[PDB]
Each structure stands twice: as structure tokens, then as C-alpha cells.
């Protein structure tokens, strides 16, 4: 699903403000053509046989 709420890592109540003990769970990849193998983006498809 989609969830953009702010993580509460510590035992401190916070809302809206991001920073210490208020983390954003969504972080992005970075892809450049000069990266090595292992940092290359690999397209993955699976199957759901039953």
C-alpha cells in the first residue's frame, strides 16, 4: 500500500516536523551509468503458479 506518515523511532511524540526521532520511511535509489555491477538496476518479474 501507500503510507507517507512519519516514523516514530524513539519514545518521543512528534508530528509534522521531520528530524530527530521523526523519520521519513521513503528513500530513493540513485542510478548512474558509471556504477558497478550490483548497483545496477535489475528488472525483476515473478510468476504465481498454483
Amino acid at each position: 500500500d501507500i503510507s507517507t506518515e512519519i516514523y516514530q523511532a524513539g519514545n518521543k511524540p512528534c508530528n509534522g516536523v521531520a528530524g530527530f526521532n521523526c523519520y521519513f520511511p521513503l528513500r530513493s535509489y540513485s542510478f548512474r551509468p558509471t556504477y558497478g555491477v550490483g548497483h545496477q538496476p535489475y528488472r525483476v518479474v515473478v510468476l504465481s503458479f498454483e
Epitope: 551509468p33 558509471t34 556504477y35 558497478g36 555491477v37 550490483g38
Partner: antibody, heavy 118, light 109 residues
């Protein structure tokens, strides 16, 4: 429809050396720019690939972070500022042109190069 | 990987020899190769595309091909003007870096 370099000379090791070449000719936003270094008596090593407009940059393993490049559109200048010069950093630089919106394919003609020695 | 090249290429005026670049897996057999010739005192110049056609126009006395993990270029009708250095360029896609790697160095005699 051509590229010419800039003049330079010998500099002290462990300093910053400014290198640049102009760019003119066709449209600018849809042609990637290659720079490549060549050492005398050996084979050349690939330096950088640059996307104009947003100024996208990418660097090789042996030069990641130790070299800095800047680019612009209206003035059409392409700068590197070399730092941490060794005796290995005495070579000739070339600025190039690519296919456009693609970093794979043949290389368009280079300039006259810039020689740097320590 | 490293793209080993012979140190020199012997020849006499008026005959055919082959100059080759031997590479590792996923460097020559994966992507295409590029042949380059460096005339002394001049900027280098492109001579071939992917080895099935000529870029703008050259007489067909030079022929390029691939074999497994290596690339070869057969040259004929050798002249004293064409004595230069030959280079090969390829996309490496190796571990920790995937730059435009080049070959070693050869001299035409």
C-alpha cells in the same frame, strides 16, 4: 561546429588547475558531452560524461570525487578544476560530443586537447 | 576488464596483417567495439562504427570482425603513411566501475 581548448602551463603539485573548452555548432540541450584524458606513450582513459541543461554528471572509479566539473548553457562553458595533482596527472585532456540523449555509440570529433604537467 | 593488446604490429608496404584486441567476458561479447587510429601530431579520428558498415566512407581494404571475446581488424595495401597506433574502445560493465575502457598499445611497422 567545432571545439577549441584553452591555454595552460605547468603548475605546482597539490593545487587546483582550471581547464575549459568552448562549445558551438548545433543545438545544445539534446547532445551529451564526453571528456577523455590521454597519456603520452599509453592508452587514453575515459574521464566524464555530462548532460547539458540540468547539468547531469557522472565520473569513473579512479576519479570519483577527486575532480570537479561545472557546466552551463547560455555562456556555453565546460569547466573542470583539478585538485591533488600527482605525476600521474600529467596528460592531455579532450572534450567531445556524443549521439544525443544516449551515452552509448560512436564518438564525435574531439578538440586539440590541453596538456597538463606537474 | 583490461583489454590486452599486442605491443606492436609488424608489416611491410603492400600486404595484409590483422590487429586484434582480446578481452574478457561481458566486455567484447556483450557490447560492440570501436577501432581508432592515432596519426602523429593530429587529433584522433573515427574510422569504423559497429563492424558491419563504414561510417561515412573509406575504401573497403580494411575489414573488421568479432570472434568470441575478441575483435579483429585486417588491413591490406599497407603504406608508409598509415604507420600509426591502433586502439580499441569498449563498454566494460565490470564490478565497481563500468567506464569506456580502452585497450593496450600497438605500433604499426
Amino acid at each position: 561546429v567545432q571545439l577549441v581548448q584553452s591555454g595552460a602551463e605547468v603548475k605546482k603539485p597539490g593545487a587546483s588547475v582550471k581547464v575549459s573548452c568552448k562549445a558551438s555548432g548545433y543545438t545544445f540541450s539534446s547532445y551529451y558531452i564526453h571528456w577523455v584524458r590521454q597519456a603520452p606513450g599509453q592508452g587514453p582513459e575515459w574521464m566524464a560524461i555530462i548532460n547539458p541543461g540540468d547539468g547531469g554528471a557522472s565520473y569513473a572509479q579512479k576519479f570519483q570525487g577527486r575532480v570537479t566539473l561545472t557546466r552551463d548553457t547560455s555562456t556555453s562553458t565546460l569547466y573542470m578544476e583539478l585538485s591533488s595533482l600527482r605525476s600521474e596527472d600529467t596528460a592531455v585532456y579532450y572534450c567531445a560530443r556524443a549521439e544525443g540523449s544516449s551515452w552509448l555509440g560512436w564518438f564525435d570529433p574531439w578538440g586539440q586537447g590541453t596538456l597538463v604537467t606537474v | 576488464s583490461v583489454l590486452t593488446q599486442p605491443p606492436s604490429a609488424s608489416g611491410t608496404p603492400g600486404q595484409r596483417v590483422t590487429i586484434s584486441c582480446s578481452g574478457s567476458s561481458s566486455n567484447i561479447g556483450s557490447n560492440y567495439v570501436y577501432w581508432y587510429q592515432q596519426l602523429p601530431g593530429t587529433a584522433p579520428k573515427l574510422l569504423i562504427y559497429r563492424n558491419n558498415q563504414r561510417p561515412s566512407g573509406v575504401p573497403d581494404r580494411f575489414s573488421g570482425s568479432r570472434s568470441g571475446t575478441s575483435a579483429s581488424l585486417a588491413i591490406s595495401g599497407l603504406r608508409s603513411e598509415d604507420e600509426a597506433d591502433y586502439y580499441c574502445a569498449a563498454w566494460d560493465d565490470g564490478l565497481s566501475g563500468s567506464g569506456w575502457v580502452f585497450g593496450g598499445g600497438t605500433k604499426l611497422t
